[PDB]
Amino acid sequence: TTDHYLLRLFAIAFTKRRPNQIKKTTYAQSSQIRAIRRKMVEIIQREAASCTLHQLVSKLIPEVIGREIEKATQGIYPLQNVHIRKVKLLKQPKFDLGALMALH
């Protein structure tokens, strides 16, 4: 983030079974999976690199990221549900009571 917090985002995304279909397996091809994962990492990088941590949590709460991944991956293969399953803060290099009290 812009406040120099490094963090890992783990996103999960299940494939959409299209209504009015007859075939039982909704398998995406492997190249299609690689394209989906490329668009997923592109979306989460482009929409998590610009904001601070408080705006990132405010976007994580109503799941705007998974909604935009669902909206932008449906030209490659439609996805049943995209969630971000883990956020892990690795290093926080600052202790600042100014922003930490501007939160509270």
Partner: protein
């Protein structure tokens, strides 16, 4: 809950980065920095249109439905409205959700989408047959690039720096008040001013980090008095084409570059300062040289009010204005406390 899920809400304010000239109190709708600009990004969609007026009317449609939910719900002590903008020229369709909280905080709300920058690049690219629109189209694209895109990372970096540098906030307030009494802040954008005061805190050589607001203010005025802007650009830690194409500096005087902004032009040349010998910029370096000269010749005493009284010399026409105000206006509803007419200004009257 919306048809398009929220993704990012980033206020871009000097009230976030602790550099509004007046520190906020509850209420003051008169005040300049009171409507607090906030950029907002939705999730990605392909259903935004492909023209400027249409995308902006879709934007105010989303602002209208946000304001409709806000006026419906039980926090409706919050009041809101939608209002136009002119600061981006030629985009007459820019509107905001301006929202007042019960504790008097006013917030300017604007939506960002992914196709605006590409559309303004389209406007820079097209109309090639006219052959004179590209410079002012670049001005509009980079004014957008100021107010919408770079201000988020800007307030993030100044917010993460202002805790480690604590006198920086009254120092930018004092240098900005000096620019206010010397009539320079209307052509000078504020981000250039915050970077200008920020050089003395983050590149403090050969002095210490300023542990006093007056120390930081004096270091800013002497760095301006010793800054020869011809040969020296200001590179801060929070080029070789422009002095070739502009050797007399008729277009740009200040070059303030960062790892944020590596072009050095976004807060100086984009605004379009008039810059010959007899204008705002050379007048600014002349006032700072006069400040350093007075603080050399007479010292530091109660006659430091010469730095805060303007000279009003070397101006062609001078026009004095008075506005239809009562006594103690505007100050008492700005929340600033001069003017002893407002009795009890030392208390919560």
């Amino acid at each position: 809950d919306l048809p398009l899920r929220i993704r990012h809400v980033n206020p871009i304010c000097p009230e976030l980065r602790h550099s509004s000239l007046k520190t906020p109190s509850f209420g003051p709708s008169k005040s300049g920095p009171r409507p607090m600009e906030v950029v907002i990004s939705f999730e990605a969609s392909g259903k935004w249109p492909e023209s400027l007026i249409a995308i902006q009317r879709t934007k105010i449609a989303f602002l209208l439905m946000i304001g409709r939910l806000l006026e419906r719900f039980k926090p409706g002590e919050i009041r809101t409205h939608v209002g136009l903008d002119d600061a981006r020229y030629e985009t007459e369709n820019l509107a905001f959700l301006d929202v007042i909280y019960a504790s008097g905080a006013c917030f300017r709300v604007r939506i960002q989408a992914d196709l605006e920058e590409s559309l303004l690049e389209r406007q820079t690219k097209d109309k090639t047959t006219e052959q004179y629109l590209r410079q002012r189209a670049s001005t509009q694209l980079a004014s957008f690039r100021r107010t919408f895109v770079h201000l988020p990372l800007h307030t993030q970096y100044i917010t993460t720096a202002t805790t480690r540098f604590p006198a920086l906030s009254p120092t930018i307030r004092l240098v900005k008040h000096w620019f206010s009494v010397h009539k320079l802040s209307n052509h000078f954008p504020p981000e250039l001013l915050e970077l200008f005061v920020l050089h003395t805190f983050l590149a403090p050589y050969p002095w210490d980090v300023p542990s006093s607001p007056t120390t930081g203010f004096l270091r800013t005025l002497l760095f301006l008095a010793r800054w020869d802007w011809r040969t020296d650009p200001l590179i801060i830690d929070t080029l070789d084409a422009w002095r070739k194409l502009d050797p007399g500096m008729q277009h740009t005087v200040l070059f303030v570059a960062t790892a944020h902004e590596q072009s050095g032009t976004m807060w100086t040349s984009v605004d379009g300062h008039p810059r010959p010998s007899k204008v705002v910029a050379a007048r600014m370096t002349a006032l700072a040289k006069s400040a350093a000269r007075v603080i050399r010749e007479q010292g530091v005493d109660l006659d430091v009010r010469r730095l805060f009284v303007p000279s009003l010399k070397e101006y062609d026409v001078l026009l004095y204005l008075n506005t239809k105000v009562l006594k103690s206006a505007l100050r008492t509803y700005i929340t600033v406390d001069p003017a002893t007419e407002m009795n009890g200004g030392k208390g919560q009257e």
